[PDB]
Design a protein around this motif. Sequence first.
Motif, mmCIF file in Angstrom:
data_model
loop_
_atom_site.group_PDB
_atom_site.id
_atom_site.type_symbol
_atom_site.label_atom_id
_atom_site.label_comp_id
_atom_site.label_asym_id
_atom_site.label_seq_id
_atom_site.Cartn_x
_atom_site.Cartn_y
_atom_site.Cartn_z
ATOM 1 N N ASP A 50 0.863 -1.197 0.000
ATOM 2 C CA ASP A 50 0.000 0.000 0.000
ATOM 3 C C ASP A 50 0.896 1.243 0.000
ATOM 4 O O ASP A 50 1.078 1.930 1.004
ATOM 5 N N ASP A 52 0.767 4.292 -1.165
ATOM 6 C CA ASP A 52 0.292 5.634 -0.863
ATOM 7 C C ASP A 52 -0.396 5.748 0.491
ATOM 8 O O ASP A 52 -0.934 6.820 0.811
ATOM 9 N N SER A 54 -3.140 4.593 1.599
ATOM 10 C CA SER A 54 -4.577 4.812 1.525
ATOM 11 C C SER A 54 -5.380 3.823 2.355
ATOM 12 O O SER A 54 -6.577 4.079 2.595
ATOM 13 N N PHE A 56 -5.746 0.740 1.222
ATOM 14 C CA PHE A 56 -6.213 -0.205 0.236
ATOM 15 C C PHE A 56 -5.129 -0.341 -0.805
ATOM 16 O O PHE A 56 -4.398 0.609 -1.087
ATOM 17 N N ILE A 57 -5.078 -1.507 -1.416
ATOM 18 C CA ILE A 57 -4.246 -1.710 -2.591
ATOM 19 C C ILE A 57 -5.136 -1.418 -3.795
ATOM 20 O O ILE A 57 -6.045 -2.187 -4.104
ATOM 21 N N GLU A 58 -4.904 -0.284 -4.447
ATOM 22 C CA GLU A 58 -5.623 0.071 -5.658
ATOM 23 C C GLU A 58 -4.958 -0.565 -6.872
ATOM 24 O O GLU A 58 -3.875 -1.162 -6.788
ATOM 25 N N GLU A 61 -1.376 0.156 -7.674
ATOM 26 C CA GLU A 61 -0.450 -0.548 -6.803
ATOM 27 C C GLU A 61 -0.405 -2.020 -7.126
ATOM 28 O O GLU A 61 0.660 -2.651 -6.971
HETATM 29 CA CA LIG Z 1 -3.004 2.387 -1.635
#
Ligand SMILES: [Ca+2]
Length: 107
Positions: A50, A52, A54, A56-58, A61
């Motif tokens: 992760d 950034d 956030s 969450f793993i977007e 990523e």
């Molecule tokens: Ca993230």
Amino acid sequence: GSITTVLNATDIAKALAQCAGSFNHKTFFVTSGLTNKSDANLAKVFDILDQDRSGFIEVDELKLFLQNFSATARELDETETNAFLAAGDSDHDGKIGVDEFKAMVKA
Ligand SMILES: [Ca+2]
Ligand SMILES: [Ca+2]
């Protein structure tokens, strides 16, 4: 700390070489050793992924997933990123949270 405080370097190397052509997240989790790590170690790995912070793993990523295991590894392609997201995104919000990550690595 680094990823080799979690996994063995030899296992990481084999997992990376075998997906140079085609990645499959379940295959990688087994070969890398992720599949046999504690839930708390998987939360460690989640924190690394992760980038950034956030929570969450977007998908951006996930495209860079392998580069958390070796800085010079390749990007995942779109089919590979889509399949990764679809396997783990059980709450259908488009991204992977830490519980989802821990679950998908082992169940
Ligand atoms: Ca993230
Ligand atoms: Ca999700």
